[PDB]
Structures are given as C-alpha cells and as structure tokens.
Amino acid sequence: DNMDVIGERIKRIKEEHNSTWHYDDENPYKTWAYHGSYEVKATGSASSMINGVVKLLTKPWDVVPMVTQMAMTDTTPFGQQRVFKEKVDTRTPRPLPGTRKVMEITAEWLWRTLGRNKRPRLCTREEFTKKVRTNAAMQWDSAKAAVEDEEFWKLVDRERELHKLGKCGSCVYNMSRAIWYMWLGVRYLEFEALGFLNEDHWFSRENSYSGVEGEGLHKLGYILRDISKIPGGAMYADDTAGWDTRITEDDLHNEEKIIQQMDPEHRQLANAIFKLTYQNKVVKVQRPTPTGTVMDIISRKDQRGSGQVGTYGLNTFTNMEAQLVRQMEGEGVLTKADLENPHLLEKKITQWLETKGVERLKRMAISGDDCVVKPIDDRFANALLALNDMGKVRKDIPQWQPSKGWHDWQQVPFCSHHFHELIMKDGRKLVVPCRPQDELIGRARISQGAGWSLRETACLGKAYAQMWSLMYFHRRDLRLASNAICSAVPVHWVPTSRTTWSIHAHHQWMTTEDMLTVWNRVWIEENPWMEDKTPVTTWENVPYLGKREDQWCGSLIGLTSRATWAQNIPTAIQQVRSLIGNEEFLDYM
Numbered sequence: 001d002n003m004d005v006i007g008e009r010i011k012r013i014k015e016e017h018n019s020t021w022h023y024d025d026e027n028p029y030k031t032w033a034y035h036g037s038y039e040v041k042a043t044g045s046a047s048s049m050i051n052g053v054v055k056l057l058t059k060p061w062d063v064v065p066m067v068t069q070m071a072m073t074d075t076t077p078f079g080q081q082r083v084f085k086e087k088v089d090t091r092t093p094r095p096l097p098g099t100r101k102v103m104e105i106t107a108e109w110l111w112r113t114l115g116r117n118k119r120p121r122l123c124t125r126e127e128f129t130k131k132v133r134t135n136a137a138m139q140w141d142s143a144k145a146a147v148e149d150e151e152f153w154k155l156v157d158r159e160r161e162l163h164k165l166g167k168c169g170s171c172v173y174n175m176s177r178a179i180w181y182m183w184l185g186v187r188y189l190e191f192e193a194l195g196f197l198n199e200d201h202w203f204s205r206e207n208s209y210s211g212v213e214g215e216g217l218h219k220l221g222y223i224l225r226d227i228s229k230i231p232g233g234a235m236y237a238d239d240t241a242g243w244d245t246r247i248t249e250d251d252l253h254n255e256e257k258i259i260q261q262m263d264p265e266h267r268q269l270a271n272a273i274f275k276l277t278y279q280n281k282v283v284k285v286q287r288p289t290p291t292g293t294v295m296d297i298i299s300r301k302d303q304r305g306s307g308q309v310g311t312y313g314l315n316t317f318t319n320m321e322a323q324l325v326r327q328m329e330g331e332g333v334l335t336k337a338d339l340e341n342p343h344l345l346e347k348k349i350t351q352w353l354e355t356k357g358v359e360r361l362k363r364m365a366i367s368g369d370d371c372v373v374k375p376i377d378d379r380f381a382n383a384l385l386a387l388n389d390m391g392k393v394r395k396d397i398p399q400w401q402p403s404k405g406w407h408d409w410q411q412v413p414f415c416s417h418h419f420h421e422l423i424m425k426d427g428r429k430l431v432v433p434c435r436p437q438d439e440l441i442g443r444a445r446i447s448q449g450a451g452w453s454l455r456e457t458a459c460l461g462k463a464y465a466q467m468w469s470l471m472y473f474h475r476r477d478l479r480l481a482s483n484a485i486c487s488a489v490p491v492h493w494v495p496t497s498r499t500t501w502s503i504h505a506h507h508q509w510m511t512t513e514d515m516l517t518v519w520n521r522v523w524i525e526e527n528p529w530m531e532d533k534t535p536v537t538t539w540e541n542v543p544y545l546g547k548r549e550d551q552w553c554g555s556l557i558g559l560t561s562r563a564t565w566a567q568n569i570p571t572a573i574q575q576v577r578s579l580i581g582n583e584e585f586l587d588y589m
C-alpha cells in the first residue's frame with residue numbers, strides 16, 4: 001500500500017535487529033498494518049511509585065478508592081497491549097461527501113483567519129536547545145546531553161537532507177544512544193517545521209478567538225465567565241471518545257493546508273512532516289509473548305501520534321473547525337441533504353463564515369479535544385449529523401441522544417476542571433479552578449521515578465503542596481495538607497520534577513519564594529480581571545469555597561477522621577522532619 005514512504009524506516013529497524021527479526025503470525029493488529037517484531041527487554045511497571053512524604057501527611061486518604069486507583073496505572077507490555085486493543089485498533093467511517101466539502105471550506109477559511117497577522121516560520125536548533133535546557137532545570141537530562149553533542153545535530157542534518165528529497169529513514173513514533181538520538185531528532189525536525197504554531201502563539205485567544213494558549217489554568221474560568229455573557233443558548237462541553245483515534249485522513253489533509261502560507265524552504269520541510277510522519281507513520285509497540293517480550297512495528301495512514309507536540313495545535317485547529325460546522329448545522333445552514341451532497345452550495349457556507357465566523361469563534365473556548373461552545377440557541381443540542389459524520393462521536397452517550405448543556409458557566413467541564421466565582425472578605429471576586437479532590441490528592445501521592453532519594457521525593461511533595469496553595473487554596477483539606485508538607489520540607493529545598501504535563505500549567509509553584517507573595521502576583525497584580533490591585537496581606541483573607549461546595553467536591557471536612565488528622569498533623573510533620581534530619585524548617589500551621 002504505502003511501502004515506498006515507510007519502507008526505508010522498516011528496512012533500518014529490520015537491519016539493526018536482524019538477529020531476532022521475525023514475522024509473528026499471532027500479532028493482534030486488525031486496523032494497523034503489521035510489518036514484524038524483534039526481541040526487547042520489557043519496560044514499565046504494573047503500579048506507580050508512592051510519594052511517602054505526601055502519603056504520611058494525608059493519612060485519611062489512605063483508604064479512599066480513587067486515591068488507591070491512581071497508583072495502579074499499568075505501563076508494562078500487558079498494559080500497553082490492553083490500551084491499544086480497546087482504544088487504538090479502530091477504523092473511523094469516512095465522512096460523507098458534503099461533510100468533507102464543508103470541512104474543507106471551513107479549514108481554508110480558518111487557516112486564512114489564523115494567519116491574518118502572523119506568518120509561519122521555521123524553528124531553530126538554539127530555540128529547541130533553550131527549551132530543552134529550561135525544562136531540564138525544573139528524559140530532560142538525556143535530552144540536555146544530546147543537544148550539547150554535535151553528533152546529534154549532524155544526525156539531524158542527515159535526516160533533514162532525506163526529508164528534502166521526500167524520504168524518511170529514522171522518524172519512528174514510540175507508543176542505545178543511536179535510537180534515543182533518532183527519536184529526539186524526529187521531535188526536533190517536527191519542531192523545526194511545525195513548532196511555530198506553539199512558539200508564535202497561533203492558538204492564543206487574541207489570534208484564534210476560540211483558543212486559550214498561554215492563558216494558564218488560573219485564567220480559564222474567567223474566559224468561561226466572559227463567554228457566559230454572550231447572548232445565546234446554553235454552554236455545551238461534549239467530550240469526544242478517543243479524539244486522537246478519530247482524526248481522519250480528511251482531517252489530516254485539511255490540517256496540511258497551512259503549508260500554503262509558508263516560504264518555499266519551510267513548506268518543503270513541513271510537507272515532509274505531514275506526508276512522511278503524520279499521514280504515513282511507523283510505530284513501535286511492546287507486546288508480551290509466551291517466551292518473552294517483542295517490539296512490534298506497525299503503520300497506518302490516519303489518527304495522531306500523541307507524542308508529537310505539534311498535535312496540540314492541530315487538534316485545536318480541527319476541533320475549532322468541527323465546532324463551527326456543528327454551529328452551522330444548529331443554525332440551519334447545513335442540512336442532512338447537504339451532508340450527503342458532493343455538489344452542496346459552497347457559497348452559503350462561505351457567506352456564513354465571512355459574516356458570522358469570527359463571532360461564532362468568540363463563543364468557544366477550545367484546547368486540543370476540549371471544547372466549550374455557547375451557540376446562538378439550543379438547536380445545537382440536537383445538531384449531531386455533522387459531528388457524528390466527521391467521526392467525532394461523543395463519549396458514553398447514544399449517538400443521537402441530544403447534548404446536555406449548562407446554564408451555569410460554573411458547572412461547565414473544561415480541561416479536567418470546573419470553575420467557581422468566590423467572594424473574598426473585602427468584596428472582590430475571584431474565579432478559581434477546581435476538580436474532585438480525590439484526583440488532586442491521588443496524583444500528588446504518586447512519585448515519578450525509581451531510586452529517588454528522600455530529598456527528591458520531599459521536593460516533589462513540596463511542588464504539589466505549592467501548586468495547591470496557588471491554584472486549589474479554596475479547598476480546606478488542600479490548604480491544610482499544603483501547609484503540613486511545606487512545614488515538613490527544609491524551606492530552602494527547591495521543588496523538583498513537575499506536578500503536571502498540562503499546557504495550562506505555568507509552574508509558578510516551582511520556586512522558594514513565599515507562596516502568599518506568589519499568590520498576590522498571580523491572583524491580584526497580574527490578574528487582568530482584578531481591577532483593584534490591593535494586596536492580600538494574610539492567608540486569612542484568601543477565600544475558601546463554600547463548605548457545602550467543598551464537601552460536594554470531595555472534602556472530608558466534617559468527618560471525624562479528618563478532624564483527628566487536623567488535630568494530630570504537628571505529630572506527622574515532626575516525624576517527616578526527624579527522617580529528613582537537622583535542616584531549617586518553618587512552621588506554617
């Protein structure tokens with residue numbers, strides 16, 4: 001089918017592992033082309049490492065089911081195969097000809113709108129090097145060593161010369177030093193050709209209208225509140241089932257239209273990324289066999305490779321396009337007859353885009369596969385023909401059952417959170433991010449690496465605690481647990497690793513600066529929705545959620561076990577201090 005594009009990559013893998021290369025007839029691949037297997041040592045673990053510092057200071061959550069579940073993520077070849085079979089080995093039916101036509105018209109208009117002020121450009125070796133260096137001082141260490149080796153860049157140049165001839169020899173996606181250099185080299189080449197979407201803020205709210213890039217978790221609630229003021233129907237936030245697996249060959253060709261705005265030298269490189277690694281891909285996946293573990297080499301023409309970071313911007317683009325198409329259907333612009341029609345009237349779609357498209361983009365908050373839409377009316381709730389036909393089937397709901405919208409922006413699911421408007425004691429309002437408290441505690445109790453010292457583990461606990469003090473201060477249990485962790489860890493110990501990989505995280509908690517000072521900077525000084533810049537001088541003036549809402553959202557406040565924990569927390573803090581040693585601590589309780 002496509003061996004002329006993927007053949008050189010498979011030939012190189014096969015030559016490198018010819019001692020154990022074989023065709024396994026028991027391969028479970030149904031929708032992916034299977035090329036072969038070779039022996040590998042199994043990677044991953046059946047369960048996550050536990051952060052003992054966070055665990056010792058959150059004893060009431062030792063029982064809680066969601067907390068116990070989050071520590072059971074299986075990353076072994078058995079776990080990889082399970083996820084692959086249940087989620088990735090699917091085929092999306094091809095959209096109808098009228099659906100493909102409206103998508104193409106909308107994609108061309110959207111790219112033109114997105115590129116009205118900005119022009120695409122190539123990203124560079126020093127840009128990638130700087131990003132890698134700033135992230136290593138938060139594998140990043142391995143990546144920092146690779147960017148400092150001139151042989152890595154000479155390998156990058158050889159692969160770029162193949163891409164310029166329309167060939168690919170080593171850009172393989174993963175579901176010795178040489179293979180790590182080839183993977184990081186593939187990521188560099190992708191960054192060089194498509195990194196501009198992220199680096200130049202193409203999906204910022206000012207540039208894209210719907211986008212939220214660069215806003216930060218602390219600003220998303222304010223944007224949903226601003227959207228709530230636009231006249232129209234309810235706010236809809238439908239979750240797509242496995243968004244990345246529903247990116248069709250038609251979606252990929254619509255995303256590729258951005259190459260039309262590039263300079264010749266950039267278009268050549270971006271066309272190679274689109275054709276060789278996005279629209280044709282070679283993937284490695286581990287699989288357990290009766291006699292050991294193999295690495296399977298598979299390929300397909302559609303879906304995304306999640307590891308690519310160019311996928312965030314392209315997912316945002318395709319979601320903005322799909323939601324505009326759904327809004328057109330709700331408004332009666334797109335009928336069932338149009339979706340089936342190759343010959344639909346292009347001009348009525350163009351006219352709707354040119355007269356109402358930007359206004360309709362302003363009614364949305366879109367981040368990758370996450371969307372919030374406030375349509376002009378509720379007909380949108382039942383406009384499902386185009387959405388299902390485009391392959392974006394909603395998760396856990398019958399295909400034709402109407403979407404449920406929200407009339408309170410505070411109840412809307414966006415980027416794994418919901419948002420509350422709080423009234424401070426001085427009358428000022430704050431709009432804060434929130435999620436089930438068991439998820440926040442469960443995540444903070446997971447360590448990220450093996451062989452970590454008590455220092456590295458305590459510093460990751462401190463990073464989680466400071467993130468809670470800045471984003472989730474309004475949750476009573478989290479402010480208390482945060483104070484306990486910060487009192488148990490040396491004040492000069494710098495938080496390490498990362499609390500989240502989310503694009504919305506700005507990592508203001510990765511500091512040894514006083515958290516109240518940082519809180520003031522984020523919530524008051526730099527908050528554009530805070531008109532009165534009066535600083536808050538004490539945590540007693542930093543508000544909480546309403547007790548009832550805190551309890552509805554997972555708080556243990558009012559339980560006897562929680563009261564016992566709060567009363568005995570100086571004892572647990574002292575136990576952690578005793579094991580850390582004679583360092584400088586501070587009492588935050």
Ligand SMILES: O=C(Cc1ccccc1Nc1c(Cl)cccc1Cl)NC1(C(=O)O)Cc2ccccc2C1
Nearest residue numbers: 128131132187190191195198309310312501502503
């Ligand atoms: O860029 C990077 C990771 C990164 C680090 C070092 C070198 C390059 C990259 N990126 C990159 C690559 Cl390899 C290929 C194509 C395009 C890009 Cl831009 N990260 C985010 C940022 O802005 O800090 C963007 C993002 C997107 C999704 C989720 C989180 C974040 C934070």
Ligand SMILES: [Zn+2]
Nearest residue numbers: 168169170171
């Ligand atoms: Zn390549």
Ligand SMILES: [Zn+2]
Nearest residue numbers: 418434435553
């Ligand atoms: Zn909440």
